[PDB]
Amino acid sequence: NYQPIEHRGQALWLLADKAIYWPARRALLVADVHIGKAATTEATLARLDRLLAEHDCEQLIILGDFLHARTARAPATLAKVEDWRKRHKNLKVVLIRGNHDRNAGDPPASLDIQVVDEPWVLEPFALQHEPQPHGTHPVLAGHVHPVFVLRLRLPCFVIDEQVSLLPAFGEFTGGWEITPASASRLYLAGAERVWPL
């Protein structure tokens, strides 16, 4: 399931697997994948496989935090990421780098993906990892792992005119808690559904 919304003149599909499908651009957007981070690698790639099979995607765009830290990521993470990519040979991939990605020297060239530094404008949005305001464009960003507490922390889409937050696609603990008092539009991701609050 997904929740169709209209944002900055664009239809966007908030997906229950913590991702955004952008039909006009045939674009799948994810943030904070952390490939190779344990709760592993095979499971994160298989979820992407399913999203790619469910929607007509010509490109995948990663809003930073692609690979988990080399010294702590699951063995051979890099290898089957490479197999996965060339299994999706016709898919265009773009990593928008945050501080961790750029410091790590990610991605390796053998992955055959595109790499830019935040912000990268793709009209009408400035795409970023770090959720800081942009002077000319509305922002889609990640990095803080937004969650909402029910009673239970659930990943949360945060849709806002200035800076919108995608929930982390990959494993994480804690996360920046979005309070009920938020002025933004909130959508919870969990149990295969998206829940507008």
Query: Does the annotation flag 65 for ligand binding?
Result: yes
Query: Does the annotation flag 55 for ligand binding?
Result: no
Question: Which positions lie near Mn ion, rule CB under 5 A?
Answer: 32, 65
- Compute the least distance from the CB of residue 106 to Mn ion, in Å: 13
Query: Does the annotation flag 143 for ligand binding?
Result: yes
- Compute the least distance from the CB of residue 147 to Mn ion, in Å: 13
- Compute the least distance from the CB of residue 170 to Mn ion, in Å: 7
By beta-carbon proximity to Mn ion, the closer residue of 26 and 173 is: 173
By beta-carbon proximity to Mn ion, the closer residue of 65 and 118 is: 65
- Compute the least distance from the CB of residue 58 to Mn ion, in Å: 25
Stated length of the chain? 197
By beta-carbon proximity to Mn ion, the closer residue of 17 and 65 is: 65
By beta-carbon proximity to Mn ion, the closer residue of 98 and 138 is: 98
CA 166 and chain centroid, separation: 6
78-111 as b/e: b if 16+ CB within 10 A? bebbbebbeebeebebbbbbbebbeeeebbeeeb
Query: Does the annotation flag 145 for ligand binding?
Result: yes
**Counting Cβ atoms within 10 Å, is residue 188 exposed (0-12), middle (13-18) or buried (19+)?**
buried
The DSSP 8-state label assigned to residue 166 in this structure reads P
Alpha-carbon distances, residue 188 vs 108, 110, 113 (angstroms): 34, 36, 30
Query: Does the annotation flag 99 for ligand binding?
Result: yes
The rounded distance, in Å, linking the Cα atoms of 12 and 5 is: 5
Q: Which residues are annotated as a binding site for Mn(2+)?
A: 32, 34, 65, 99, 129, 143, 145
